[PDB]
Design a protein around this ligand. Structure first.
Ligand SMILES: Nc1nc2c(ncn2[C@@H]2O[C@H](COP(=O)(O)OP(=O)(O)NP(=O)(O)O)[C@@H](O)[C@H]2O)c(=O)[nH]1
Ligand SMILES: [Ca+2]
Ligand SMILES: [Ca+2]
Ligand SMILES: [Ca+2]
Ligand SMILES: [Mg+2]
Ligand SMILES: [Mg+2]
Length: 166
């Protein structure tokens, strides 16, 4: 089968782990345990193709971010995650994209911009603002909620479909 190595990056607390665990294990992690570097593997059929997904869940907390660049280096596609109720996390996306470019030594790496926590109403990043950022990078924007499952499969499968175009 075909293997896709996906890496999930973004600021601390935006929901990278909750998204990944919802996809892989079908439950919502309510507590906040900061991640160092975790890996998940799942065989899934995506558009009629049996896929092996290797998903790297990375640290967003600066204190835990040692060697994150060495993990990111291995990725074939990246979910760049911010939270729609965390303006700073959205502003931080620029720096994650720059890090991705640096570690892949490429200007056109498969990526999807993900606005997570879309179940929450304290929105400070409007959809149009994120759409514009994604457009500037030439990538899709998708909103998700790790809590309700909204958009979760769509985000990860869209990333696979982006890898397939490159
Ligand atoms: N309402 C809501 N809460 C969410 C959502 N995603 C994550 N959370 C909550 O936000 C907190 C942080 O989630 P977590 O997945 O640990 O974030 P992270 O990006 O992996 N953090 P780190 O970078 O430190 O590893 C948790 O309390 C989690 O339940 C979401 O879509 N909706
Ligand atoms: Ca739970
Ligand atoms: Ca480099
Ligand atoms: Ca593109
Ligand atoms: Mg985490
Ligand atoms: Mg505003």
């Amino acid at each position: 089968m075909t293997e896709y190595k996906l890496v999930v990056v973004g600021a601390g607390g935006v929901g990278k782990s909750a998204l990944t665990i919802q996809l892989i294990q079908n439950h919502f992690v309510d507590e906040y345990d900061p991640t160092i570097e975790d890996s998940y593997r799942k065989q899934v059929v995506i558009d009629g193709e049996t896929c092996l997904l290797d998903i790297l869940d990375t640290a967003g907390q600066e204190e835990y971010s040692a060697m994150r660049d060495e993990y990111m280096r291995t990725g074939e596609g990246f979910l760049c995650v911010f939270a729609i109720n965390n303006t700073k996390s959205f502003e931080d996306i620029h720096q994650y994209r720059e890090q991705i470019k640096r570690v892949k030594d490429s200007d056109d790496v498969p990526m999807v911009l993900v606005g997570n926590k879309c179940d929450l109403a304290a929105r400070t990043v409007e959809s149009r603002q994120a759409q514009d950022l994604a457009r500037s990078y030439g990538i899709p924007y998708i909103e998700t909620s790790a809590k309700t499952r909204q958009g979760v499969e769509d985000a990860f499968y869209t990333l696979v479909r982006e890898i397939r175009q490159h």
